[PDB]
Design a protein around this ligand. Sequence first.
Ligand SMILES: [Zn+2]
Ligand SMILES: [Zn+2]
Ligand SMILES: [Zn+2]
Ligand SMILES: [Zn+2]
Ligand SMILES: [Zn+2]
Length: 116
Amino acid sequence: KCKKTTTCEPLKYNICLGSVLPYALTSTVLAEDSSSQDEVHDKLSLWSGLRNAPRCWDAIRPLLCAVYMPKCEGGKVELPSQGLCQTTRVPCAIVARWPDFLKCTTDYFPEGCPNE
Ligand SMILES: [Zn+2]
Ligand SMILES: [Zn+2]
Ligand SMILES: [Zn+2]
Ligand SMILES: [Zn+2]
Ligand SMILES: [Zn+2]
């Protein structure tokens, strides 16, 4: 439930929203609005407008990176965790009120995952 089968490809960039990613491979399969790593990069640029809400921005960065530039290894991608979603909901409550995020749905944000 914590991983999804997919084809891994090398990361286009080793930076996500100002963080250095320690892993080398990714997939776009979790980013339902994106059909390539090129599109992912453009969507993340749009998300960066949220930098003007600094408390929400700090919380949401690892969630956006876990969705848009997730770690892929062995033909599997890791999903963003329920715990990460629930924490992000509070500082980003006012902002955006992505219904899956607001509800922290358990198919998209599974419980009991190693990277929580
Ligand atoms: Zn490219
Ligand atoms: Zn921080
Ligand atoms: Zn949990
Ligand atoms: Zn859903
Ligand atoms: Zn729990």
